[PDB]
Design an enzyme around this catalytic site. Structure first.
Site, PDB file in Angstrom:
ATOM      1  N   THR A 134       1.141   2.267  -8.531  1.00 17.81           N
ATOM      2  CA  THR A 134       1.260   3.482  -7.889  1.00 17.81           C
ATOM      3  C   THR A 134       1.697   4.780  -8.725  1.00 17.81           C
ATOM      4  O   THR A 134       2.164   4.806  -9.609  1.00 17.81           O
ATOM      5  CB  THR A 134       2.167   3.670  -6.654  1.00 17.81           C
ATOM      6  OG1 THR A 134       1.896   2.454  -5.705  1.00 17.81           O
ATOM      7  CG2 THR A 134       2.184   4.981  -5.800  1.00 17.81           C
ATOM      8  N   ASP A 181      -3.199   7.746  -6.119  1.00 18.18           N
ATOM      9  CA  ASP A 181      -4.225   6.946  -6.190  1.00 18.18           C
ATOM     10  C   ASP A 181      -4.377   5.835  -4.925  1.00 18.18           C
ATOM     11  O   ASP A 181      -3.762   6.477  -3.848  1.00 18.18           O
ATOM     12  CB  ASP A 181      -3.715   6.179  -7.439  1.00 18.18           C
ATOM     13  CG  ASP A 181      -2.827   5.063  -7.311  1.00 18.18           C
ATOM     14  OD1 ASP A 181      -3.025   3.801  -7.599  1.00 18.18           O
ATOM     15  OD2 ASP A 181      -1.549   5.387  -6.909  1.00 18.18           O
ATOM     16  N   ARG A 206      -4.468   2.214  -5.133  1.00 16.96           N
ATOM     17  CA  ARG A 206      -4.216   0.696  -5.355  1.00 16.96           C
ATOM     18  C   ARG A 206      -2.884   0.124  -4.955  1.00 16.96           C
ATOM     19  O   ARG A 206      -1.936   0.670  -5.050  1.00 16.96           O
ATOM     20  CB  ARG A 206      -4.417   0.349  -6.951  1.00 16.96           C
ATOM     21  CG  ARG A 206      -4.006  -0.933  -7.186  1.00 16.96           C
ATOM     22  CD  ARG A 206      -4.164  -1.296  -8.947  1.00 16.96           C
ATOM     23  NE  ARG A 206      -5.556  -1.274  -9.238  1.00 16.96           N
ATOM     24  CZ  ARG A 206      -6.001  -1.397 -10.412  1.00 16.96           C
ATOM     25  NH1 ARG A 206      -5.157  -1.482 -11.441  1.00 16.96           N
ATOM     26  NH2 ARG A 206      -7.273  -1.410 -10.892  1.00 16.96           N
ATOM     27  N   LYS A 212      -2.114   6.517   0.626  1.00 20.18           N
ATOM     28  CA  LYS A 212      -0.588   6.710   0.197  1.00 20.18           C
ATOM     29  C   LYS A 212      -0.375   8.128   0.630  1.00 20.18           C
ATOM     30  O   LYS A 212       1.016   8.363   0.298  1.00 20.18           O
ATOM     31  CB  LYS A 212      -0.716   6.326  -1.254  1.00 20.18           C
ATOM     32  CG  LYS A 212      -0.982   5.027  -1.691  1.00 20.18           C
ATOM     33  CD  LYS A 212      -0.401   4.930  -3.208  1.00 20.18           C
ATOM     34  CE  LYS A 212      -1.259   3.523  -3.737  1.00 20.18           C
ATOM     35  NZ  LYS A 212      -0.754   3.316  -5.108  1.00 20.18           N
ATOM     36  N   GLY A 243       6.955   3.112  -4.258  1.00 17.80           N
ATOM     37  CA  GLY A 243       8.021   2.012  -4.022  1.00 17.80           C
ATOM     38  C   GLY A 243       7.428   1.062  -3.037  1.00 17.80           C
ATOM     39  O   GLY A 243       6.286   0.736  -3.108  1.00 17.80           O
ATOM     40  N   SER A 276       4.820   3.910 -10.599  1.00 13.39           N
ATOM     41  CA  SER A 276       4.716   3.175 -12.041  1.00 13.39           C
ATOM     42  C   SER A 276       3.732   4.354 -12.972  1.00 13.39           C
ATOM     43  O   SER A 276       4.071   4.133 -14.357  1.00 13.39           O
ATOM     44  CB  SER A 276       3.965   1.960 -12.108  1.00 13.39           C
ATOM     45  OG  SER A 276       2.784   2.025 -11.414  1.00 13.39           O
ATOM     46  N   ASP A 314      -1.974   3.334 -16.459  1.00  9.34           N
ATOM     47  CA  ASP A 314      -0.948   2.519 -15.859  1.00  9.34           C
ATOM     48  C   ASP A 314      -1.775   1.479 -15.011  1.00  9.34           C
ATOM     49  O   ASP A 314      -2.685   1.661 -14.306  1.00  9.34           O
ATOM     50  CB  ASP A 314      -0.146   3.277 -14.766  1.00  9.34           C
ATOM     51  CG  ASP A 314       1.057   2.547 -13.952  1.00  9.34           C
ATOM     52  OD1 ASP A 314       1.630   1.572 -14.708  1.00  9.34           O
ATOM     53  OD2 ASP A 314       1.024   2.481 -12.734  1.00  9.34           O
ATOM     54  N   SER A 362      -1.575   1.336 -11.150  1.00  4.25           N
ATOM     55  CA  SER A 362      -2.177   2.384 -10.532  1.00  4.25           C
ATOM     56  C   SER A 362      -3.755   2.231 -11.010  1.00  4.25           C
ATOM     57  O   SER A 362      -4.082   1.569 -11.752  1.00  4.25           O
ATOM     58  CB  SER A 362      -2.042   3.815 -11.042  1.00  4.25           C
ATOM     59  OG  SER A 362      -0.490   3.940 -11.083  1.00  4.25           O
TER      60      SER A 362
HETATM   61  C1  LIG Z   1       2.471   1.317  -5.483  1.00  2.10           C
HETATM   62  C2  LIG Z   1       3.990   1.598  -5.780  1.00  2.10           C
HETATM   63  S1  LIG Z   1       4.629   1.095  -7.471  1.00  2.10           S
HETATM   64  C3  LIG Z   1       4.111  -0.529  -8.124  1.00  2.10           C
HETATM   65  O1  LIG Z   1       6.039   1.154  -7.595  1.00  2.10           O
HETATM   66  O2  LIG Z   1       4.021   2.120  -8.409  1.00  2.10           O
HETATM   67  C4  LIG Z   1       2.185   0.837  -3.927  1.00  2.10           C
HETATM   68  C5  LIG Z   1       2.771   2.246  -3.105  1.00  2.10           C
HETATM   69  C6  LIG Z   1       1.901   1.961  -1.909  1.00  2.10           C
HETATM   70  C7  LIG Z   1       0.940   1.007  -1.484  1.00  2.10           C
HETATM   71  C8  LIG Z   1       0.563   0.783  -0.308  1.00  2.10           C
HETATM   72  C9  LIG Z   1       0.634   1.727   0.969  1.00  2.10           C
HETATM   73  C10 LIG Z   1       0.131   1.676   2.072  1.00  2.10           C
HETATM   74  N1  LIG Z   1       1.116   1.658   3.175  1.00  2.10           N
HETATM   75  C11 LIG Z   1       1.411   2.746   0.564  1.00  2.10           C
HETATM   76  C12 LIG Z   1       2.091   3.051  -0.753  1.00  2.10           C
HETATM   77  N2  LIG Z   1       2.992  -0.146  -3.600  1.00  2.10           N
HETATM   78  C13 LIG Z   1       2.397  -1.390  -3.547  1.00  2.10           C
HETATM   79  O3  LIG Z   1       1.513  -1.845  -4.102  1.00  2.10           O
HETATM   80  C14 LIG Z   1       3.637  -2.368  -3.287  1.00  2.10           C
HETATM   81  C15 LIG Z   1       4.669  -2.638  -4.476  1.00  2.10           C
HETATM   82  C16 LIG Z   1       5.645  -3.391  -4.502  1.00  2.10           C
HETATM   83  C17 LIG Z   1       6.480  -3.182  -3.280  1.00  2.10           C
HETATM   84  C18 LIG Z   1       6.479  -3.418  -5.927  1.00  2.10           C
HETATM   85  N3  LIG Z   1       3.243  -3.631  -2.860  1.00  2.10           N
HETATM   86  C19 LIG Z   1       3.824  -4.084  -1.482  1.00  2.10           C
HETATM   87  O4  LIG Z   1       4.269  -3.474  -0.652  1.00  2.10           O
HETATM   88  C20 LIG Z   1       3.279  -5.436  -1.220  1.00  2.10           C
HETATM   89  C21 LIG Z   1       2.426  -5.339   0.097  1.00  2.10           C
HETATM   90  C22 LIG Z   1       1.174  -4.769   0.124  1.00  2.10           C
HETATM   91  C23 LIG Z   1       0.071  -5.512  -1.082  1.00  2.10           C
HETATM   92  C24 LIG Z   1       0.363  -4.657   1.596  1.00  2.10           C
HETATM   93  N4  LIG Z   1       4.184  -6.530  -0.872  1.00  2.10           N
HETATM   94  C25 LIG Z   1       4.959  -6.993  -2.013  1.00  2.10           C
HETATM   95  O5  LIG Z   1       4.424  -6.996  -3.122  1.00  2.10           O
HETATM   96  C26 LIG Z   1       5.875  -7.792  -1.551  1.00  2.10           C
HETATM   97  C27 LIG Z   1       6.206  -8.876  -2.496  1.00  2.10           C
HETATM   98  N5  LIG Z   1       7.402  -9.700  -2.028  1.00  2.10           N
HETATM   99  C28 LIG Z   1       8.041  -9.455  -0.849  1.00  2.10           C
HETATM  100  C29 LIG Z   1       7.402  -8.106  -0.115  1.00  2.10           C
HETATM  101  N6  LIG Z   1       6.544  -7.589  -0.380  1.00  2.10           N
END
Ligand SMILES: *[C@@H](CS(C)(=O)=O)[C@H](Cc1ccc(CN)cc1)NC(=O)[C@H](CC(C)C)NC(=O)[C@H](CC(C)C)NC(=O)c1cnccn1
Ligand SMILES: [Cl-]
Ligand SMILES: [Mg+2]
Ligand SMILES: [Mg+2]
Ligand SMILES: [Mg+2]
Ligand SMILES: [Mg+2]
Lengths: 243, 244, 219, 240, 241, 196, 204, 224
Positions: free
Chosen positions: C1, C17, C19, C33, C47, C129, C166, C169
């Site tokens: 993100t 972004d 992803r 997002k 997060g 990130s 990144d 992202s």
């Molecule tokens: C990027 C956040 S980061 C890695 O800290 O830069 C991104 C932000 C985001 C994504 C999707 C939406 C849509 N509502 C909003 C904001 N976050 C993610 O990609 C998260 C990153 C995890 C928490 C580090 N991914 C998730 O939350 C995924 C579910 C998604 C793919 C539907 N969940 C998990 O990875 C997970 C794993 N184990 C237990 C619970 N969740």
């Protein structure tokens, strides 16, 4: 009718008769007064000697709150004690949080809100006391008087109980004849006189005089009881004025 | 204190009756008549709406006939608001039972539950009872087709045919006269409407003053179907039976 | 993100972004997002995505009720307080890292809200990130009181930095431009990567899969 | 302080009447006339802004309230009771519905929730019933346009058109004559302004009348609820 | 006749305890008035100190709720102080939760919703007070909002409260009928206070000294009450023209 | 973080750096660590930003409500409310707060509340990670009843050194002057203080 | 130890032209031990389908819970729940156990009855919605399914083309996972017919 | 459970013929940092008791308030608050002891070691110790923390058992205490030169001495 049978009920006038009936218990009590002086306050009370078996100077009526506030009341004595117990809790919680001892106006509203709360519901009885109280804080001396309704105001002089009209007339003379102010030692003497003059309304039984005072110069802003020589000097002054 | 103003809703009279239950029944006696008739091949629920203006939107209106699950329905007589409280409680009990046992709730078990709730208001809490009488029409695979009624007391009983609300005395005599055990749904439909037509306090019985429903196993592959009749369908069945 | 925001002359430009990842895998290449709080306030989310989504929705709902009762548009400080005080209460267990931007009666405001309940009030912020990649672009090129199309470019450039540099992202660039006179929700603002073209067709022909039994039911 | 009123203040009298509900309905009767009319492509709700003083700013007192973007409410009876129902209706539309399903409730279900709150004041310990009747107009995707009435009892009925409060008997008769199933929204507004003129004594203009519609979407959707401006009402009063 | 002792409906659809709380409102025998300027909102109220033993500085029915909001009460002082303490508490909690100063009308509506609860719940009595809130709101400008024991509330261009409220109301009504504006077209609050006092003198037919009045003034970002000498200066200016 | 409050003749001055770090990353380089709890009662914050912000907001609320009822609170009263929160919640907080305020009666007053929740009234106070490096300097150079210009220079030199040696500190030196005259905000940039 | 991979199994869903498909394997195990080859992971509430992978006790519990909720929904709303609405319901329901979650990977699939639009969605165990048009994957062979779907999938497939795509995606992914397989089911869902097919696959 | 942050070191004390002496340095250490140089750790209660406190300073400040509050509360409805019904050392101690043990038993101790020194109504010397565990003991000499190891050995050479207390004058006792404070300053790394000393005598009353200093310091042998 039936509007007077329950507390917190408005009569068609807009009155709460139960509160007004509490006032009757206050009017039935012994005379108590308060005198605001230059740098403090003086409290005095009539203690009726029902019998020779009462131990002199033992059944103390004036109560201290924190170290700087004096409270005295006329009417149902236990209700007055209950209110002071609450006042002590309020004064304690204030000092715990804010460090400084509770200001007198602040303290006056704490009692005021609590007494007023007992006129909001039928499950409680109003307080059967008018309470005269005050002391010295950072903004100087303050004297208050608090009625069964929750009403309170600041006073130059205050009086309640059976001899209140007699006392009030005397307090009004002092206010007129001393616009520049009354000293603490003067106020103690005058308090003694006023209780002695107000004793004509309770003249059947003889009585015992009790005086207390807070004064910035005379007591370092702390509540103390007038004892010994200073008490006897005030009694002598009072006895001379009635004769 | 407060004791002064307490009606004391949960006491016995000197005769051994519950004042508020009796008075709630009096309330219900003024409500629009509801009739349940159980046949060998289905149950009929018929009920009379009340007051009605020409301006009441009938097709989106539901004051009498409610659905508890796919197998059980109720006809209401009394305070509609009070009924809806109890109905949503019943709808939950049915789903709690389904969740627990993975089988649809038996009709009597649901009825007892509601009736036990009504009872509770008569024995404790100091609240007024629910001013509602239900006719429960339902099916399960133990007893087949079942009709019950409950009332504000919390007492419930089973029936072959029954009425609640207004003119129950008159309604129950007319049903007792023309009901027979071998009767069929199409005949029970006709009996229900004829009974309402005679006991109604209105001048005539019309489609806009009626709610109507059938619980038939009469479906393809022996499965129970609830049919809440639409305004146009009630009008057709009134012409069919020859009332209008 | 990679999420970012800047305060420009007329208002706020938010960026993000698209992803969404599970571990090292990409579940959605075009997810939203930038969240809606109120008509004048939006929130970029980083997060834990569930926490980010439900926290913005709850505060958005409560602000809607607040705004109906007061009859006036909500403020960014009240959005900020409500997010902040909730996140603080939960001591970092709600892993919501927000960039909160909006335009009040009192002008444009931009906040960064952290999972533990701290907030900074700033003219530009980055989170996720890809925050360091994005922040490099802002430290390189930000200036106060930018024009709209300039600020749009700077945020877009900052999100791009995150996208490429990144691994967390990627995908498209979403912007949200907020001023007193308008709200522009640009999704997507840019498509910096084309979807990879496949050279073969690997789809099987009918009857290739081995079936045991079949059932058809109509509705 | 013990809330000792844990017993019902509404009870059945020997005749089967619930006294406090009937008396609440008497309070509604004394209240100012409000009405609702349903067209094919919309619903209209209207009432008189009975100003308590000419110094009071009657714009600040909203009798017609938005509950959701597609649902509106108006009342007759006790204003303060109405206000707290509107607060709860708005809230319940979020807590028990929007936060679960991600969309606003349909008209009938929100009506049902309000009805429930009013029923509970009719049976719970230590409360009187609400002294209002509500007219809730709304739209939703699967039911379309609808208009409901909600009484102090908690009972609710859907209407094609109706009126409540002061001159409701006369107003309902007026509406029965004018209403048909082919009315356009403008025709319904026209009829609402005619019907409301009968019950109004004094000034009759956009400043003394409050009138809202559930109609087309005003630019995810736009809101179908729209409160007519003081000017928009006056324009239609010239074609009256 | 217990329908007159608690807050339940009489057969007429009336709440007699609410009506009798309205009568308690005038038990002080004090008249208040509130008007709006361009930049300000002025509230004036009669001050009566009947006892010579009273400290006149502690006799007040005007309250500083927040820095921006002032509240004058028509009714007995215990209920007035009950209402004041709550309004202060609510205004402080608001600022903490939502991060901006509580608007005048939002407080008024909040206090009104509380008043409504006492009219529906039996164990609580209504407060025997009318609360007039004043501020210069940062969105709405000069604001007057009033609450009563019924739980009713509404915004005002100007208002008056007390035994002789109808006389003051009509006096004000007539002035705004002339000027054809919702406010006193005046730059300085000092002259808006002079207007308020002058129009109360005319309406009540009584002259005032400095100790017979009590004045509150709301400006942008503060509400404050005038001292006896500030009022005296105000009275001098009235007399000199 | 490097923060300090210093009493002088006309009142008291609070001073702070502007750096907030997440490990080695500078998350915010223009942080305002001098926060207002009342008109002329301010505090310097060090420790958890979430905790010190949450505390400062609660204090502001308590003193706002105190003012509604009992008029302007003393600086001691403000310090007591800070203390009460910090001490009673010591297990869940990481807050090192300096409280500074101007009465007309008491003049300038400085109270420090370190991690324990204890209160210490001092002529001046230093705190935060960067404070360790200037105990020597501050003790040698502090005098009582300095002029405003002397106290501004004392704080500027002190925090300049704190910043030079502490990596957790940096950016601009913000100051807040509290006197009878009012509240003055001062700022000093790297190019000014680094060459001292 | 890891609750999401004790019992094993997979779900995949895809959109096509005026149709959706959802498919699952049939395995239930205790880690290495295979226990049941009749454990279906796809359920339906009206015309909305819900696949659930993960800890099998939670799969069962959530199925029973969404049946409960959608039943009451239907009684109150007087209509069947739609996929978009149900998706929100699932998300809400999962997030209300935020700090003690159901160890599951749900997948919604269905056609909106009014608009006719094909809909799919996925969730993490705490209810964050993956809202993708193309495909949703879940379970112990999710990585494998992602790879299969990304290379095999293309938009706007006809029902029986889509069947071959989803089936081959499931089968070949499952055969590279120890804890998936033992049979498979594929639902082909159209606006007013649903075709359920059981697949022949290797039983190891 | 916590950990002490700002800390006070040794409190030392002894009985003599007519009363008790108690002393404690004016330092509030912050670990190895000698942070606060003006901390009073002897807190008098009325004119007949001094409570000396070591350990956590925030918890000391809490106890200081509890004692201040105890004086206020004893005055309430008490016409003999400055006479027969004044607070006694034994009352003040027992209260603190109750508090300390109650707190340890809730697993949330006041992180202190306390010595309550005073003179009772009947002229008896009161000297008793209590700590964070609620452990209590009395002895002719008492000392907390570091002073237990270095002060007690020196002070016990003056009063080794009960029968030595009547033989010990106030001058001998005070000299011994001041000597012990010097020895602690040489050898305790978390002590300070500046200290306070309090004598509670049954004849001369409470004498509280502030801003004392360790002097007569032998360093000259270092140069070699
Ligand atoms: C990027 C956040 S980061 C890695 O800290 O830069 C991104 C932000 C985001 C994504 C999707 C939406 C849509 N509502 C909003 C904001 N976050 C993610 O990609 C998260 C990153 C995890 C928490 C580090 N991914 C998730 O939350 C995924 C579910 C998604 C793919 C539907 N969940 C998990 O990875 C997970 C794993 N184990 C237990 C619970 N969740
Ligand atoms: Cl409210
Ligand atoms: Mg009441
Ligand atoms: Mg540095
Ligand atoms: Mg396999
Ligand atoms: Mg195997």
């Amino acid at each position: 009718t039936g509007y007077d049978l329950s507390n917190s009920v408005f009569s068609p006038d807009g009155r709460n008769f139960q509160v007004e009936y509490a006032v009757k218990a206050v009017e039935n009590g012994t005379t108590s007064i308060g005198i605001k002086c230059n740098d403090g306050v003086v409290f005095a009370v009539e203690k009726l000697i029902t019998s020779k078996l009462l131990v002199p100077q033992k059944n103390v009526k004036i109560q201290v709150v924190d170290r700087h506030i004096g409270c005295v009341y006329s009417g149902l004595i236990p209700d007055g004690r209950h209110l002071v117990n609450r006042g002590r809790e309020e004064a304690a919680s204030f000092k715990k949080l804010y460090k400084t001892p509770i200001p007198i106006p602040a303290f006056a509203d704490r009692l005021g809100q609590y007494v007023q709360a007992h006129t909001l519901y039928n499950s409680v009885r109003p307080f059967g006391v008018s309470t005269i109280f005050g002391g010295v804080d950072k903004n100087g001396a303050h004297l208050y008087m608090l009625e069964p309704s929750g009403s309170y105001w600041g006073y130059k002089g205050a009086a309640t109980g059976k001899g209140r009209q007699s006392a009030k007339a005397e307090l009004e003379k002092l206010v007129d004849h001393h616009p520049e102010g009354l000293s603490a030692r003067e106020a103690v003497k005058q308090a003694a006189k006023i209780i002695y003059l107000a004793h004509e309304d309770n003249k059947e039984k003889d009585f015992e005089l009790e005086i207390s005072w807070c004064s910035l110069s005379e007591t370092n802003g702390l509540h103390k009881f007038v004892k010994g020589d200073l008490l006897q000097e005030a009694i002598d002054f009072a006895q001379k004025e009635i004769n | 204190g407060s004791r002064r103003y307490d009606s004391r809703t949960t006491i016995f009279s000197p005769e051994g009756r519950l004042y508020q239950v009796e008075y709630a029944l009096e309330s219900i006696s003024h409500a629009g008549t509801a009739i349940g008739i159980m046949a060998s091949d289905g149950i009929v629920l018929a009920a009379e709406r009340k007051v009605t203006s020409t301006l009441l939107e009938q097709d989106t209106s539901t004051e009498k006939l409610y659905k508890l699950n796919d197998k059980i329905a109720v006809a209401v007589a009394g305070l509609t608001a009070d009924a809806e409280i109890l109905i949503n409680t019943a709808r939950i009990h049915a789903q709690n039972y389904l969740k627990t046992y993975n089988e649809d709730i038996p009709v009597e078990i649901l009825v007892r539950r509601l009736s036990d709730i009504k009872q509770g208001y008569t024995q404790h809490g100091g609240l007024r009872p629910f001013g509602v009488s239900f006719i429960y029409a339902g099916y399960d695979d133990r007893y087949g087709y079942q009709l019950y009624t409950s009332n504000p007391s919390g007492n419930y009983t089973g029936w072959k045919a029954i009425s609640v609300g207004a003119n129950t005395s008159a309604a129950q005599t007319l049903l007792q006269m023309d009901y027979k055990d071998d009767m069929k749904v199409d005949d029970a439909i006709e009996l229900a409407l004829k009974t309402l037509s005679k006991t109604t306090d209105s001048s005539a019985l019309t489609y806009d003053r009626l709610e109507f429903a059938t619980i038939r196993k009469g479906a393809n592959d022996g499965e129970v179907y609830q049919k809440i009749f639409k305004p146009q369908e009630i009008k057709d069945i009134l012409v069919k039976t020859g009332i209008t | 993100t990679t999420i970012a925001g800047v305060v420009y002359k007329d208002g706020i430009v938010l960026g993000a972004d698209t992803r969404a990842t599970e571990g090292m895998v990409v579940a959605d290449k075009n997810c939203s997002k930038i969240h809606f709080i109120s008509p004048n306030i939006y929130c970029c989310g980083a997060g834990t995505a569930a926490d980010t989504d439900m926290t913005t929705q709850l505060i958005s709902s409560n602000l809607e009720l607040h705004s109906l009762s007061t009859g006036r548009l909500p403020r960014v400080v009240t959005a900020n307080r409500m997010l902040k005080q909730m996140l603080f209460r939960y001591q970092g267990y709600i892993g919501a890292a927000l960039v909160l931007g909006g335009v009040d009666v009192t002008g444009p405001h931009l906040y960064s809200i952290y999972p533990h309940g701290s907030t900074d009030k700033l003219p530009y912020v980055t989170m996720g990130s890809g925050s360091l990649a994005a922040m490099a672009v802002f430290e390189d090129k930000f200036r106060p009181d930018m024009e709209e199309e300039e600020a749009k470019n700077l945020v877009s450039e900052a999100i791009a930095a995150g996208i490429f540099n990144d691994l967390g992202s990627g995908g498209n660039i979403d912007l949200c431009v907020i001023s007193k006179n308008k709200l522009d929700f640009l999704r997507p603002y840019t498509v910096p990567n084309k979807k990879g073209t496949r050279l073969g067709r690997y789809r099987c022909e009918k009857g290739t899969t081995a079936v045991l039994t079949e059932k058809i039911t109509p509705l | 302080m013990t809330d000792r009123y844990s017993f019902s203040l509404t009870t059945f009298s020997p005749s089967g009447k619930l006294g406090q509900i009937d008396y609440a309905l008497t309070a509604v009767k004394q209240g100012v006339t409000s009405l609702g009319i349903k067209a094919t492509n919309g619903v209209v709700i209207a009432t008189e802004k009975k100003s308590s003083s000419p110094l009071a700013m009657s714009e600040t007192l909203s009798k017609v309230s938005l509950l959701t973007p597609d649902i509106g409410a108006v009342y007759s009876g006790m204003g303060p009771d109405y206000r707290v129902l509107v607060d709860k209706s708005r809230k319940v539309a979020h807590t028990s519905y929007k936060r679960i399903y991600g969309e606003y409730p349909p008209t009938k279900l929100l009506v049902s929730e309000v009805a429930k709150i009013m029923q509970e004041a009719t049976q719970s310990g230590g409360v009187r019933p609400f002294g209002v009747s509500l007219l809730i107009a709304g739209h939703d995707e699967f039911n379309g346009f609808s208009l409901y009435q909600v009484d102090p009892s908690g009972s609710y009925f859907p209407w094609k058109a109706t009126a409540i409060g002061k001159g409701s008997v006369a107003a309902k008769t007026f509406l029965e004559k004018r209403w048909n199933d082919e009315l356009e929204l403008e025709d319904a507004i026209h009829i609402a302004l005619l019907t409301l003129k009968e019950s109004v004594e004094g000034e009759f203009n956009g400043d003394t009348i409050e009138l809202a519609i559930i109609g087309d979407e005003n630019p995810d959707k736009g809101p179908r609820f729209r409160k007519l401006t003081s000017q928009e009402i006056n324009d239609r009063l010239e074609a009256l | 006749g217990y329908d007159r002792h608690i807050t339940i409906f009489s057969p007429e659809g009336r709440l007699y305890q609410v009506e009798y709380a309205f009568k308690a409102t005038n038990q002080t025998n004090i008249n208040s008035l509130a008007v709006r300027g361009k930049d300000c909102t002025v509230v004036i109220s009669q001050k009566k100190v009947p006892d010579k033993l009273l400290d006149p500085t502690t006799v007040s029915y005007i309250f500083c709720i927040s820095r921006t909001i002032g509240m004058v009460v028509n009714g007995p002082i215990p209920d007035a102080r009950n209402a004041a303490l709550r309004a202060k508490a609510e205004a402080a909690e608001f600022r903490y939760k939502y991060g901006y100063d509580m608007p005048c009308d939002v407080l008024a509506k909040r206090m009104a919703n509380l008043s409504q609860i006492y009219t529906q719940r039996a164990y609580m009595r209504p407060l025997g007070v009318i609360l007039t809130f004043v501020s210069v709101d940062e969105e709405l400008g000069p604001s007057i909002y009033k609450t009563d024991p019924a739980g009713y509330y509404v915004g005002y261009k100007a208002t008056a409260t007390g035994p002789k409220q109808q006389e003051i109301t009509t006096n004000l009504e007539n002035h705004f009928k002339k000027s054809k504006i919702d406010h006193i077209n005046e730059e300085s609050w000092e002259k808006v206070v002079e207007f308020a006092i002058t129009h109360m003198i005319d309406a009540l037919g009584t002259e005032f000294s400095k100790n017979d009045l009590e004045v509150g003034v709301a400006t942008k970002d503060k509400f404050f009450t005038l001292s006896a000498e500030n009022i005296e200066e105000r009275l001098v200016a009235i007399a000199e023209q | 973080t490097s923060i300090m409050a210093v009493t002088f003749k006309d009142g008291v001055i609070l001073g702070a750096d502007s750096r907030t770090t997440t490990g080695a990353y500078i998350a915010n380089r223009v942080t305002d660590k001098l926060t207002r709890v009342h008109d002329k009662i301010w505090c310097c914050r060090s420790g958890s930003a979430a905790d010190t912000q949450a505390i400062a907001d609660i204090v502001q609320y308590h003193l706002e409500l105190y003012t509604s009822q009992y008029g302007t609170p003393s600086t001691e009263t403000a310090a007591s409310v800070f203390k009460e929160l910090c001490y009673e919640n010591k297990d869940n907080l990481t807050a090192g707060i300096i409280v500074a305020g101007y009465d007309d009666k008491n003049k300038g007053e400085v109270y420090t509340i370190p991690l324990g929740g204890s209160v210490h009234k001092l002529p001046y106070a230093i705190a935060g990670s960067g404070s360790t490096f200037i105990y020597g300097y501050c003790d040698k150079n502090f005098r009582e009843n300095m002029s405003k210009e002397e106290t501004v220079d004392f704080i500027k030199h002190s925090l300049s050194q704190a910043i030079k040696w502490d990596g957790s500190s940096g950016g601009v030196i913000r100051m807040v002057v509290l006197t009878a005259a009012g509240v003055e905000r001062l700022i000093f940039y790297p190019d000014e203080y680094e060459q001292l | 130890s890891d609750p999401s991979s004790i019992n094993g199994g997979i779900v995949v869903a895809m959109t096509g032209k005026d149709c959706v498909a959802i498919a699952c394997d049939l395995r239930l195990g205790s880690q290495s031990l295979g226990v049941s080859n009749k454990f279906e992971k796809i359920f339906h509430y009206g015309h909305v389908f819900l696949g659930i992978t993960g800890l099998a006790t939670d799969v069962t519990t959530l199925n029973e819970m969404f049946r409960y909720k959608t039943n009451l929904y239907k009684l109150k709303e007087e209509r069947a729940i739609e996929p978009e609405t149900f998706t929100q319901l699932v998300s809400s329901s999962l997030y209300e156990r935020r700090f003690g979650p159901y160890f599951v990977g749900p997948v919604v699939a269905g056609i909106n009855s009014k608009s006719g639009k094909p809909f799919i969605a996925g969730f993490d165990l705490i209810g964050c919605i993956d809202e993708a048009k193309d495909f949703i994957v879940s379970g112990t062979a999710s990585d494998q399914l992602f790879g299969m779907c990304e290379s095999l999938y293309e938009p706007n497939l006809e029902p029986e083309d889509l069947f071959e795509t989803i089936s081959q995606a499931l089968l070949n992914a499952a055969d590279r996972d120890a804890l998936s397989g033992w049979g498979a089911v594929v639902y082909i869902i159209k606006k007013d017919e649903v075709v359920k097919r059981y697949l022949k696959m290797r039983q190891d | 459970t916590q950990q002490p942050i700002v800390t006070g070191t040794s409190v030392i004390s002894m009985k003599y013929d007519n009363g008790v002496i108690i002393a404690a340095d004016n330092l509030g250490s912050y670990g190895s940092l000698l942070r606060f140089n003006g901390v009073e750790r002897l807190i008098p209660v009325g004119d007949n008791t001094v409570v000396g406190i070591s350990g956590d300073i925030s918890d000391m400040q809490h106890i200081e308030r509890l004692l201040k509050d105890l004086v206020t509360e004893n005055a309430y409805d008490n016409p003999l608050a400055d006479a027969e019904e004044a607070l006694e050392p034994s009352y003040i101690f027992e209260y603190l002891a109750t508090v300390m043990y109650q707190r340890r038993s809730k697993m949330n101790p006041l992180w202190n070691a306390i010595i309550v020194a005073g003179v009772q109504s009947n002229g008896d010397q009161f000297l008793r110790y209590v700590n964070l565990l609620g452990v209590t003991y009395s002895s002719p000499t008492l000392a907390t923390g570091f002073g237990a190891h270095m002060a007690n050995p020196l002070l016990r050479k003056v009063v080794d058992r009960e029968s030595d207390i009547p033989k010990t004058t106030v001058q001998v006792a005070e000299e011994a205490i001041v000597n012990a404070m010097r020895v602690l300053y040489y050898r305790d790394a978390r002590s300070s030169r500046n200290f306070s000393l309090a004598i509670i005598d049954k004849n001369t009353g409470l004498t509280f001495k502030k801003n004392l200093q360790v002097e007569n310091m032998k360093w000259d042998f270092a140069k070699d």
